[PDB]
Amino acid sequence: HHHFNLPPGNYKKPKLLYCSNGGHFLRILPDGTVDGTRDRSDQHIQLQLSAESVGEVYIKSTETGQYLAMDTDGLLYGSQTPNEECLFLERLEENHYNTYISKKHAEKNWFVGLKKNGSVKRGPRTHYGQKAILFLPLPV
User: Fold this and answer.
1) Are the beta carbons of 61 and 44 closer than 8 angstroms?
2) Where, in this chain's numbering, is heparin bound?
3) DSSP the chain
4) Sign of the CA dihedral 122, 35, 112, 19?
5) Is residue 87 a contact partner of residue 104, using CB atoms and an 8 Å limit?
6) 117 among annotated binding-site residues
7) How close are the terminal C-alpha atoms of the chain, in Å?
8) Where does 1-140 sit in CATH, by number?
């Protein structure tokens, strides 16, 4: 369903997922809530990515051990255990950024995305060409 242009990074270290849309870092709160924060000091923005298959990743909270996931209704949530909803297709975009597509809902083009106000976008509201879907992985 999608291209195979991969980003040049690795999973050796944890990262911050910076969204240029509103300038927020992806955050997974202890209660499972998912959103964005501009506070670089936040303890819930440190994420550990790992590869399942080439270009297939898990995005986990280093702080809580929770996995980023997208539900049946396109909502992002923090999962205690890895499941099919936790896999994302990590790709290069605009020859620079990182995008994350819901593997489970790949055919629907549901991406991980942050609005300018720091709220997460619902899968069906996302789409190729948006700024909300563009992330820059930063060192922690």
Assistant:
1) yes
2) 21
3) ----PPPS--SSS-EEEEETTTTEEEEE-TTS-EEEES-TT-TT--EEEEESSTTEEEEEETTT-PEEEE-TTS-EEEESS--GGG-EEEEEETTTEEEEEESTTGGGT-B--B-TTSPBPPGGG--TT-STT-EEEEE-
4) positive
5) yes
6) no
7) 32
8) 2.80.10.50
